[PDB]
Chain A
Amino acid sequence: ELDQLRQEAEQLKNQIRDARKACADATLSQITNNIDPVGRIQMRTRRTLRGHLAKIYAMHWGTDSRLLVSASQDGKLIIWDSYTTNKVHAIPLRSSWVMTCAYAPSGNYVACGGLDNICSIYNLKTREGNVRVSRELAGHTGYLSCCRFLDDNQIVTSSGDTTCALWDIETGQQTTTFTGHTGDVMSLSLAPDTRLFVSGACDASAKLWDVREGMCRQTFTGHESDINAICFFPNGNAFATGSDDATCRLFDLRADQELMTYSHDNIICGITSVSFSKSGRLLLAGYDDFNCNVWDALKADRAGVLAGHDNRVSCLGVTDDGMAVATGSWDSFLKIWN
């Protein structure tokens, strides 16, 4: 039955491709061509955050749009007050090889991990006056590339072993294991309502997972190389991916297919991070050519360039209120653009 199953799988792939083609009545660039362009967007740095002595790998905004957490290879995880550029907390790590970090939506906990293969969760609002490790979540057999909190008790992580997992922080055990990728998983993005998430991997594909059921509902393909960053569109019906093809792509969840490709002939450098503005009109992406481009998400025009870094831009994010964009790079600085 092995050949029959292989033929059935190929027939199903053809059926899916034909279904996707049938729905492609028009593309985004043929609909939005009548909308006034956003024009040139010129942003300036308003704050520079200094203190790390090594490459910064991850950065995440809190839900108050004022505090942010960053992690670097010097063994520190630092919580910053973005309005005054004060350091609020500095957490030493047991392993300096940190890939990701996260800031709980309540502001009570932070999390990070990397090569150790352990996701550590730190309790910030503690008695005794000092930040301490609350949990160490072990179970993955590869590096942790991304982790995001759903609530103070649930965290979802992505690993280098091709698996994603939903963890119960208090129990310390995995609750849901998400399998189906072939390559390592590089990025994770939660839906606005926490019910779904999208993961990107080195298979040049992304999968949409149902947090409660554990199954993959959709698989999106189109990139030629590894996908390093995924971000949901603010309304939850679309997401953008960045890859080593020097291309970003906007995918629609309802049409089950790619809607827009963001590329330029003068860009031959990879994409390290993606994000959207509060309204969804601007798409931001960090590149390993030491700058960050701002794209018009509806026309695929380049709206502007942020270019204050001396090394690879490793991370970026946008505040929940849309007031500012923060970036981090391998030059050990963070910058806030507005």
Chain B
Amino acid sequence: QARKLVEQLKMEANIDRIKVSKAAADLMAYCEAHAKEDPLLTPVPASENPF
């Protein structure tokens, strides 16, 4: 009962965490690296557009 909650919380406390600014930098790097291949962010010409 309560022991299950305590053990699960202990498992969640013992997690290696990184800085928020690093995660944000990684999300920006991903978005920039793949920006050129996103048909919705960068509209695709009619000769290429399947729809």
> Is there a contact between chains A and B in the complex with CB atoms less than 8 Å apart?
yes
Give the chain B neighbours of A38 by CB distance below 8 A: 41
**25 pairs, CB–CB < 8 Å, chain A vs chain B:** A2-B2, A5-B6, A6-B2, A12-B13, A16-B13, A26-B20, A31-B28, A38-B41, A46-B51, A83-B50, A180-B8, A216-B12, A237-B27, A255-B23, A256-B15, A257-B20, A277-B41, A278-B34, A281-B41, A322-B38, A323-B39, A323-B44, A323-B51, A325-B40, A338-B49
How big is chain A's contact interface, by range? 35 or more
Cross-chain contact A237 with B26 (CB below 8 angstroms)? yes
Give the chain B neighbours of A298 by CB distance below 8 A: 27-28, 31
Q: Which residue of B lies closest to A280 (CB)?
A: B31
Give the chain B neighbours of A8 by CB distance below 8 A: 6
CB interface residues, A 276-302, toward B, < 8 Å: 277-282, 297-298
Give the chain A neighbours of B21 by CB distance below 8 A: 25-26, 31
Cross-chain contact A31 with B12 (CB below 8 angstroms)? no
Name the distance in Å between B39's Cβ and chain A's nearest Cβ: 5
Q: Which residue of A lies closest to B40 (CB)?
A: A277
Digitize A301-338: 1 where CB-to-B-CB distance is under 8 Å, 0 elsewhere.
Answer: 00000000000000000100111110000000000101
| Chain A interface residues (CB < 8 Å from chain B) | 2, 5-6, 8-9, 12-13, 15-16, 19-20, 23-28, 31-32, 35, 38, 41, 43, 46-47, 82-83, 180, 215-219, 233-235, 237-238, 252, 254-257, 259, 277-282, 297-298, 318, 321-325, 336, 338
**Alpha-carbon distance between A185 and B19 when the two chains are bound, in angstroms:** 30
Cross-chain contact A219 with B18 (CB below 8 angstroms)? no
How big is chain B's contact interface, by range? 35 or more
Give the chain B neighbours of A26 by CB distance below 8 A: 20-21, 24
Give the chain A neighbours of B19 by CB distance below 8 A: 23, 25, 255
Give the chain A neighbours of B6 by CB distance below 8 A: 5, 8-9, 12
| Chain B interface residues (CB < 8 Å from chain A) | 2-3, 5-6, 8-13, 15, 17-28, 30-31, 34-35, 37-41, 44, 49-51
* Additional A-B contacts beyond A278-B40, A323-B44 (7; CB < 8 A): A16-B12, A26-B21, A31-B21, A43-B40, A216-B8, A237-B23, A321-B39
**Alpha-carbon distance between A218 and B9 when the two chains are bound, in angstroms:** 9
Residue among B15, B17, B41, B44 with max Cβ neighbours from chain A (10 Å): B41
Name the distance in Å between A161's Cβ and chain B's nearest Cβ: 18
Name the distance in Å between B21's Cβ and chain A's nearest Cβ: 5
Give the chain A neighbours of B5 by CB distance below 8 A: 5, 9
